[PDB]
Design a protein around this ligand. Sequence first.
Ligand SMILES: [Ca+2]
Ligand SMILES: [Ca+2]
Length: 275
Amino acid sequence: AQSVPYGVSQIKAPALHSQGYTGSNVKVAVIDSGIDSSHPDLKVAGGASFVPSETNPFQDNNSHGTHVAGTVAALDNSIGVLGVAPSASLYAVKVLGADGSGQYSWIINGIEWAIANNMDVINMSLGGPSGSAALKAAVDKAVASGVVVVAAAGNEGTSGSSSTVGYPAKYPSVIAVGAVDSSNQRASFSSVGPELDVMAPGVSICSTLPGNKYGAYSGTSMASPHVAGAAALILSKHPNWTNTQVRSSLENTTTYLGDSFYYGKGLINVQAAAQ
Ligand SMILES: [Ca+2]
Ligand SMILES: [Ca+2]
């Protein structure tokens, strides 16, 4: 029996699935710790690894990558869970090792690979407190080339009156995603700031884990894939839409929750976004 995680229903993806919009032929790159391609509920189309000591991108020694992937595209079948865009062409771009960290050059190299291989959407459930001219250059190049770039806002919470949104989420070209729970309330760990763009479910998110398992995790990392998948559904319905049109639609059809410093434009509604 297959279970639909609350987050998928909360952003109204199932509505599009029933109309036949499930993200087919849309290439999504999960820049992360790799994806367990042997998972029964996932179908990885390709990828690459830029982690010198972990050359197989289809082997996830952390579990973060596979979990994020499950939210983006777990298969619509009779087992496990259901992704936001279950027909999406999932790519494993391994830039984080078994411990969950990665050097910025590995991350950047992964972004470059994604651009060169024409990914339609890039998901980055990662980030740090500092940026680099090289980091900004890679994400800005992606967008100029028509790629939709989504990134977790961070899990720094509030801090006086200043932004805690991390990089690359902080760059204007990158969509920054914070997390809310099932009640649409902001998760205390969610980063805040004028850079926040939109919110998506990010608490107790059930998804795939390596070794044919399932578990729930909480983090803006779990929030991000919901919007990456959202963009993919919009593109399956509107293949001619550019990345800036896909973003404006997601940003302009949100359910307003409080102040934008904390909730950005609000929770995404993929049904309304897809028009
Ligand atoms: Ca499934
Ligand atoms: Ca941004």
